Amino acid sequence: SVKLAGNSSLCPVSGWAIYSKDNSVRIGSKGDVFVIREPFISCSPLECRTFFLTQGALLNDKHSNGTIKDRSPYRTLMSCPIGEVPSPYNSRFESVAWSASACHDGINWLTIGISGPDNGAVAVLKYNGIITDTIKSWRNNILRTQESECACVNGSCFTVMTDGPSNGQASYKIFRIEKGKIVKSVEMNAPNYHYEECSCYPDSSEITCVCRDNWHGSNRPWVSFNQNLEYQIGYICSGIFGDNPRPNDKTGSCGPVSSNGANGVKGFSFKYGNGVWIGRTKSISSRNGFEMIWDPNGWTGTDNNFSIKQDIVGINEWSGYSGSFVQHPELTGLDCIRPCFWVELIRGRPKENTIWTSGSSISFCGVNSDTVGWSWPDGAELPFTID
Amino acid sequence: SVKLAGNSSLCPVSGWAIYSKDNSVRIGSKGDVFVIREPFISCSPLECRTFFLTQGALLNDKHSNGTIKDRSPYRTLMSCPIGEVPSPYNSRFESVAWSASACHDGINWLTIGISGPDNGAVAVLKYNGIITDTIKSWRNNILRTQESECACVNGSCFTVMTDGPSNGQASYKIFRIEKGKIVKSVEMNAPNYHYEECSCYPDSSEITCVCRDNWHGSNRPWVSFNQNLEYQIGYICSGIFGDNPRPNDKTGSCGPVSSNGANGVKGFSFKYGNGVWIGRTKSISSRNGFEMIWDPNGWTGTDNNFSIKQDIVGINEWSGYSGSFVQHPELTGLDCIRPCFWVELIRGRPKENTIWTSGSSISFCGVNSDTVGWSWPDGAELPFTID
Amino acid sequence: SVKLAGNSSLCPVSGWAIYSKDNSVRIGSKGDVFVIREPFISCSPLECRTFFLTQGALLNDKHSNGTIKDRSPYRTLMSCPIGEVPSPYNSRFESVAWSASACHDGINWLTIGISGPDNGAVAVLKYNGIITDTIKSWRNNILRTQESECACVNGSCFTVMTDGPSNGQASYKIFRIEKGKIVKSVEMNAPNYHYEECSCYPDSSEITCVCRDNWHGSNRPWVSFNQNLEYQIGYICSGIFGDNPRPNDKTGSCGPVSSNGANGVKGFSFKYGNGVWIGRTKSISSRNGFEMIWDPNGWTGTDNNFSIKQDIVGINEWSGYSGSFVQHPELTGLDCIRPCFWVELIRGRPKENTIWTSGSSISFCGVNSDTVGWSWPDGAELPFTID
Amino acid sequence: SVKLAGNSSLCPVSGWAIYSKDNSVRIGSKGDVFVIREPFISCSPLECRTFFLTQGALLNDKHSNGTIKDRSPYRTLMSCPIGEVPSPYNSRFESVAWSASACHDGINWLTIGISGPDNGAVAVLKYNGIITDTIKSWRNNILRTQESECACVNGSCFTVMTDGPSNGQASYKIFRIEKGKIVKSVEMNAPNYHYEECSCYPDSSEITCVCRDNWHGSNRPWVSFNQNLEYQIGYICSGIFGDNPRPNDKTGSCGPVSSNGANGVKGFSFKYGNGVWIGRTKSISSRNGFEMIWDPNGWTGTDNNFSIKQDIVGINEWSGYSGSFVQHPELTGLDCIRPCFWVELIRGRPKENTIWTSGSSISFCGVNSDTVGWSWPDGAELPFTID
């Protein structure tokens, strides 16, 4: 058992090979599958797991009623092996949580689960399943975190939390954590920026996070930092806008793009020099479809030209959240940190006539060998018996 | 593999961070979840488990009928990982039992399961799943035990059993067990005291148990003892009365408080010098709500002043049994024994219009970092289909 | 990993402590539990398992129809941890079989599964899940075996198979097996004897089997032998008759007792010198109830006096097959081979108005500490929804 | 952990002993069992697993509708232990796939899963669950592979893929793979031959594959090759025609037998010098029955004489695909590579009046001890509730 180094660069990639699909909603029409949202993937040196926030209910049961609701005392962070359906019969219990993160440092799992009231929520940190720290709301307004993996470098792991308005200026903090204990934190000095639900990854010993501006940006904000929490901030400049909703692609901005900027969806992007791999919905206005775009000057350049598009989910199918996950050389035997991603395929409310809201998932890993675009949607037939 | 020392002191704590929630009843509306009551938590050096007394039936099935009944030949002691629902598909079989205790000495699990007739019940002791001892009823009147974890120090584990009336003077014995063999027992000389369902924990090489007086006390009795079974006895003095039912808080007594003293609920408290952390229901008359109170002179003082109250379950929600569990330094890496606790959330009979009685659980661990009060109730919608 | 020695004596025992109960039929009213019969228990140096013959169907499903039928191409030998319900989600696949045995030699599991047609059935032997040998029917008339554990001594394991009439003289062979290969066999020269479904155990390096005479005996036949297959044969002499059906107890015989001698039930007994522990039904005529009787001269003496009776299942409850299993000193750390037993609690046809037949189980281990009689019956409420 | 040698010869065998039966369809009438087709078996040095292509749905649920369809984005390659039903609660996720192969080199599992559109499908190769390579369609017409195990020799594993028409000349390639990376491939020069769904096994350091001609052959084509991919090609000469459909047995051909040659079923055969063990359906026109035939000159001789026939599934019962699998000396301790085989028992469409298509399985291993013919069919009663 050895700590992940995290000092190699992100592997450069030409396209995305399909890695998993769980078919959760299809299966849960009969089987005992949790109602879940906010799923994400994270890997140890030996395996990759799907983490998710349950609603303490199963699909096609009456207790799935009203699961559009985000925060309750019933929600729990749990995990299962990647590509398996999240069931009570195969899921590890992690934490009581309505917002979460998790990541493996090479030795043990760090889990962060936030529960409690909106006006004083508390993040519970566990290392190897034992409580190691807590941190309470500092603005008394829905303390919340990534909904995807934290990122680890040489025994220290890193995340971002937000507290404050989801429709205005809020407060954003970066944390360094070692063996589940917070050792350092800093508040980002980011007036006029908005950060939610960061997708953070390690690359050459430093952390890069691509987040969601829910206030006034249809491009994605980013924050990057070293192990000392010395940070930089910006927005992705590309006119290939990354949030949902958004406008049609046009000349972008290196600050927040106000057009269609309110509200958003969790997402991710991978930075390679001045270029970027952008994952986004296909629809500008709704959580439909998914695609990967390689824009070789899109981190810093404002044009709407790009070089590669790969289809992931068709424009007439439901998509949802997405996030980064990485596979370190300790797991793969490669000489670089492999980028992967997942997509949550959200079914039910508000778009469909059900009593419930739940998701399934798909995931892909970056390669330099041949790939293909297609559509790998959820596939369940709604409504269900319970509806 | 090394025996737990049990020689450090209980960690002082300022509040309780949420540790687990299983949502058993909500899930069992559809999933295959045991009807259970008398759950408890206990940990090895490697993991924490939920133990429970099944009724040999599943939720929402006809065999759940009449499960208000306490003792039958179908009841079994089983266990699963903490925070997972108790199912036939994830639960380990421990013993045939309608009353139980269990605890890990650092090397193997000790389980104690009592079955047989009311007039001659027998406790079957297992160490690593192999029968190692038995002990038969000595008063021929429902031999019974903790319904929570036993306590271990340097290779010896300790428990309390009762035999006799539940509504008058009974007989109470303390046992020392090594590798699942009873090596010593003493009968407590406690005229006018009543002991049921003890919550026992180790602290500085000695055992403290806080129990239920079902005869004539609305405060909780205690017994504490060393490894040689040299004991002391008393009642918690605080006017913050700990049992349910009880009177409104007023001046307490260091002997049994007769007002509303008959009947009771299993509970716990943690002694720190002259102070006590009291877990109790919020209602004085019914098993509703739950709260933690820090009363810095409440072990020996009779006033009803306290310093800290932390809400756990709201006053309008069902609660039930509660108990201590500990995490030893061998599990945590700390230099003290960490106090935790669980609460059983009882659903169904007698208070609700069902054919069945079952519970879910929540648990918390003591910390000195920030925490918050809230309500984490059961959340199932009764009655069920079967009712 | 070391071979079981099997050279110590059977531990002497004063009574029987309850060890497991699975509640299979009760649970299977809702859960996904196999229709099974012919269950048995067997242990390795690390764990004990329940083996059983499925009918390739679940309880409360239409495919449970007609499971009174003994032999089909759907029946499989499977196993699960002792006291858990036999489900597709927790059961290991062992062999395709409508008659079986299994036992652990200290290194790996031997399983013997007989399938094929009545006129040419083939026993498939597996060691560690790999086919190691076969043996085909030699009388072309339902080759069949123990339905309980084989017995192992110093790397060799032993069983008995029968081929021929179940209502007349048949042929009975003893086998020595090493690493799943038959190394020696002998045909028992037993004119006028009938052997079915032997319960065999090791004791002081030699094997003792107590079996079922289905032709003309209401006492039980026995065969004993050393590792070279040098055997002796007899019947239990006690007037405490061991088979079901049987007459009322009276003066017995050291040969087959013809009164009520046709038909029978699988059972067991443990020999201690001239004495015997007899497990039997409570009813003389039907598979109802169960009890343990210690008769200190019953192996060789024909009187109907006995010293100890312990109740196991009440006379108004359904019982069924029973069998021996042992726990070797390699598992327990004792200096003797511990006797245990199981009882199959058969529900459904022919006695009850269902489409199906299935069982649950209970088990006990012998001790010298205090025990108690009670009734631990199946407890399911028949008929079921499917009926 | 050591690479399989693969250098011993195939064990000569006189008959087939039954190894497994899962009863998947019978069980899935109630239990949570995947709709599957294209199952196969493959073994490591420690265990044997059943691999299968799920339809992302469970039996007796509405999402099983339309599962006659071969390729969709919901199909996944998963695996479970041999003889267990494929459930979400016991199955390991392997790959997103509508055509597959897998095999263990002695160190880790290689899985090959093909997904994407018909005009540009991509095979994703994983080694120990990590993507290690991809290969894209080279004829843009349903890139596809074995549906049974690949074959490994001294750290290299070997498979065959096809791209092009299923009813005319297509393109066939052989691949050598090391640690999940393609290191060599060659296109077979096989004008007028047709290769689909190869069953490939190792024998004396070389690979023999027996496949399906779906274009114009009712005998089976074969390809054999060394580690350098130097190959030979032919058709099985025996007048005991191996495909389904086929004509009645008559004089065969060493090239494709045109009579009833169009269409086909996946199958296998084992070469021993000039002789062959042929597994085939009993019906010439439909997927019914199964039998093993030993034809001692059938690899190169055109007569329809044979020496041994062993029944496996009766002529009036449904069969389906079949394939080889092997057990290497590293698993068995033998001095030769043991041949086994599986049979898929297909239920539902097109032959039966259901909304769905799924299968169960049986498997057998070759021995030289006594065996017997019988019928071990699927046994489910169709239609189901959902139909």
Ligand SMILES: *[C@@H]1O[C@H](CO)[C@@H](O[C@@H]2O[C@H](CO)[C@@H](O[C@@H]3O[C@H](CO)[C@@H](O)[C@H](O[C@H]4O[C@H](CO)[C@@H](O)[C@H](O)[C@@H]4O)[C@@H]3O)[C@H](O)[C@H]2NC(C)=O)[C@H](O)[C@H]1NC(C)=O
């Ligand atoms: C859970 O357990 C409860 C309690 O047993 C059970 O409710 C009971 O159901 C039974 C059957 O419906 C009821 O018993 C009947 O009561 C009526 C009077 O209300 C009697 O007339 C009936 O007797 C007649 O019918 C019998 C059968 O034909 C004859 O044997 C008899 O001589 C009479 O002709 C019968 O006793 C009982 O009233 C209820 N009790 C309640 C609701 O309190 C409940 O159904 C169980 N639920 C499940 C899911 O298992």
Ligand SMILES: *[C@@H]1O[C@H](CO)[C@@H](O[C@@H]2O[C@H](CO)[C@@H](O[C@@H]3O[C@H](CO)[C@@H](O)[C@H](O[C@H]4O[C@H](CO)[C@@H](O)[C@H](O)[C@@H]4O)[C@@H]3O)[C@H](O)[C@H]2NC(C)=O)[C@H](O)[C@H]1NC(C)=O
């Ligand atoms: C499995 O899949 C099959 C195939 O889809 C499915 O069977 C089909 O069910 C549908 C719904 O019952 C049927 O479609 C209907 O067909 C009738 C004629 O027979 C039409 O009149 C119907 O159209 C009217 O109703 C619609 C809804 O109100 C309107 O949109 C429409 O304009 C019309 O007013 C409708 O098309 C179809 O006939 C069957 N096909 C069969 C049986 O072959 C089956 O139910 C599925 N089963 C499960 C369990 O999923």
Ligand SMILES: *[C@@H]1O[C@H](CO)[C@@H](O[C@@H]2O[C@H](CO)[C@@H](O[C@@H]3O[C@H](CO)[C@@H](O)[C@H](O)[C@@H]3O)[C@H](O)[C@H]2NC(C)=O)[C@H](O)[C@H]1NC(C)=O
């Ligand atoms: C990865 O993290 C490890 C921590 O496990 C880093 O190693 C540590 O580096 C620090 C800073 O130089 C060392 O601190 C030193 O402490 C000693 C006394 O204990 C003092 O004499 C020195 O002046 C200094 O302050 C620490 O010893 C060292 N520990 C170990 C176990 O190596 C490591 O440098 C990090 N690697 C990278 C590439 O960032």
Ligand SMILES: *[C@@H]1O[C@H](CO)[C@@H](O[C@@H]2O[C@H](CO)[C@@H](O[C@@H]3O[C@H](CO)[C@@H](O)[C@H](O)[C@@H]3O)[C@H](O)[C@H]2NC(C)=O)[C@H](O)[C@H]1NC(C)=O
């Ligand atoms: C338990 O079984 C073991 C087998 O693993 C027994 O040990 C074996 O005993 C036999 C018989 O005496 C020995 O056979 C000898 O073979 C050698 C040549 O290999 C020959 O020179 C001798 O004349 C004799 O025939 C065998 O060596 C021996 N093997 C081992 C590994 O010990 C053991 O005796 C059994 N124990 C009991 C208590 O029954």
Ligand SMILES: *[C@@H]1O[C@H](CO)[C@@H](O[C@@H]2O[C@H](CO)[C@@H](O)[C@H](O)[C@H]2NC(C)=O)[C@H](O)[C@H]1NC(C)=O
């Ligand atoms: C990335 O981190 C690794 C692991 O610490 C570094 O490799 C070690 O470097 C030191 C000093 O050169 C050696 O003593 C160790 O033996 C190396 N370990 C291994 C496993 O190779 C490596 O230098 C770093 N890579 C960079 C900066 O590119």
Ligand SMILES: *[C@@H]1O[C@H](CO)[C@@H](O[C@@H]2O[C@H](CO)[C@@H](O)[C@H](O)[C@H]2NC(C)=O)[C@H](O)[C@H]1NC(C)=O
């Ligand atoms: C608690 O028990 C521990 C463990 O036995 C004691 O530590 C051991 O005691 C002596 C030192 O006094 C040494 O021989 C051992 O090496 C110690 N073991 C370890 C693991 O440190 C310890 O002294 C006791 N604690 C207190 C507070 O008295």
Ligand SMILES: *[C@@H]1O[C@H](CO)[C@@H](O[C@@H]2O[C@H](CO)[C@@H](O)[C@H](O)[C@H]2NC(C)=O)[C@H](O)[C@H]1NC(C)=O
């Ligand atoms: C039962 O078998 C055991 C295990 O083989 C015997 O114990 C061994 O005996 C030999 C010869 O005396 C010693 O060399 C070994 O060291 C012993 N092993 C152990 C683990 O003690 C034992 O003698 C036999 N018991 C009898 C006959 O009562």
Ligand SMILES: *[C@@H]1O[C@H](CO)[C@@H](O[C@@H]2O[C@H](CO)[C@@H](O)[C@H](O)[C@H]2NC(C)=O)[C@H](O)[C@H]1NC(C)=O
């Ligand atoms: C099959 O391969 C095995 C394993 O590599 C060969 O055995 C090895 O080869 C030589 C002996 O000729 C030794 O260097 C190794 O120690 C052998 N290993 C083992 C485990 O025995 C073997 O020669 C080959 N078999 C045949 C039939 O050619």
Ligand SMILES: CCC(CC)O[C@@H]1C=C(P(=O)(O)OC)C[C@H](N)[C@H]1NC(C)=O
């Ligand atoms: C803007 C980010 C936060 C602010 C509280 O809100 C999130 C949005 C979503 P969304 O998918 O956009 O809602 C439809 C669902 C998430 N659980 C919710 N986070 C929590 C903690 O409530």
Ligand SMILES: CCC(CC)O[C@@H]1C=C(P(=O)(O)OC)C[C@H](N)[C@H]1NC(C)=O
């Ligand atoms: C007072 C202590 C004992 C005396 C026998 O009784 C207990 C009380 C309850 P309670 O939750 O208070 O009942 C509603 C449930 C328990 N299983 C029951 N223990 C057994 C062994 O029967």
Ligand SMILES: CCC(CC)O[C@@H]1C=C(P(=O)(O)OC)C[C@H](N)[C@H]1NC(C)=O
């Ligand atoms: C006499 C022993 C044999 C002769 C074939 O028969 C057994 C009897 C019973 P029983 O419980 O008595 O039937 C109600 C069920 C068993 N499976 C059956 N063994 C097989 C292989 O068929």
Ligand SMILES: CCC(CC)O[C@@H]1C=C(P(=O)(O)OC)C[C@H](N)[C@H]1NC(C)=O
């Ligand atoms: C001829 C070989 C291929 C050509 C595409 O077709 C296969 C045939 C069948 P079959 O069982 O014969 O259909 C009833 C089921 C298979 N999944 C299907 N392979 C895929 C990849 O589609």
Ligand SMILES: *[C@@H]1O[C@H](CO)[C@@H](O)[C@H](O)[C@H]1NC(C)=O
């Ligand atoms: C869903 O919840 C609402 C609010 O409690 C309730 O009134 C309604 O009946 C529920 N609907 C279903 C279908 O369960």
Ligand SMILES: *[C@@H]1O[C@H](CO)[C@@H](O)[C@H](O)[C@H]1NC(C)=O
């Ligand atoms: C702990 O137990 C051992 C017996 O194994 C004994 O020797 C030792 O003195 C005990 N230690 C303490 C601190 O009581």
Ligand SMILES: *[C@@H]1O[C@H](CO)[C@@H](O)[C@H](O)[C@H]1NC(C)=O
């Ligand atoms: C049971 O099986 C018989 C014989 O096939 C059949 O005719 C009958 O309808 C079945 N009954 C039920 C309740 O499934």
Ligand SMILES: *[C@@H]1O[C@H](CO)[C@@H](O)[C@H](O)[C@H]1NC(C)=O
């Ligand atoms: C097996 O592979 C190794 C490469 O690791 C090679 O050195 C060796 O010569 C090969 N052995 C045979 C028998 O082909």
